[PDB]
Design a protein around this ligand. Structure first.
Ligand code: HEM
Length: 146
């Protein structure tokens, strides 16, 4: 169960990091592609890793993760609109985003956060971010079908 403490951690960390989300987004994607260069292929428009569209995807991940933390504490579930979730779910399903991609991204997300606010980093900070993300992903994965 997602706690008020974990919510506070995600909310404040994001509050801090959000001041430099430009540097943060670039770092995040550079981490994703350092680990799995071939993940590049999934973003069909990539065929510099400088691409315009990559920066908002990065921040979406951050914002929606922080939002899930809030909703999880408030209502005990991800309460993202049923329709936003179907739409996000379908695109990921159709471009071939698989578990390993979500998983590389989780790992990249945590590293990016550890590097960005090393002064707020701790295993509870890591887990709070990790769990909000996991619940967000599971809400999306339920909508990854035909
Ligand atoms: C919490 C995790 C994630 C969230 C919240 C999220 C959210 C979103 C959103 C809101 C869009 C808008 C795209 C649209 O409606 O056309 C999108 C697109 C997309 N995402 Fe994600 N996403 C996540 C994970 C991932 C992962 C792990 C990958 C693969 C590395 C990925 C790759 C893509 C691709 C290829 C698109 C389509 C881009 C395009 O065709 O212009 N996403 N995502």
């Amino acid at each position: 169960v997602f706690t008020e403490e974990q919510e506070a951690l995600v909310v404040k960390a994001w509050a801090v990091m959000k001041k430099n989300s430009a540097e943060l987004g670039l770092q995040f994607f550079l981490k994703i592609f350092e680990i799995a260069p071939s993940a590049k292929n999934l973003f069909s428009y990539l065929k510099p890793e400088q691409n315009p569209k990559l920066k908002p995807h990065a921040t979406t991940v951050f914002v929606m993760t922080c939002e899930s933390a809030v909703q999880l504490r408030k209502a005990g579930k991800v309460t993202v609109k049923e329709s936003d979730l179907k739409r996000i779910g379908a695109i990921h399903f159709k471009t071939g985003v698989v578990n390993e991609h979500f998983e590389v991204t989780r790992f990249a997300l945590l590293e990016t956060i550890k590097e960005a606010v090393p002064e707020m980093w701790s295993p509870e900070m890591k887990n709070a971010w990790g769990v909000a993300y996991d619940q967000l992903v599971a809400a999306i994965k339920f909508e990854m079908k035909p």
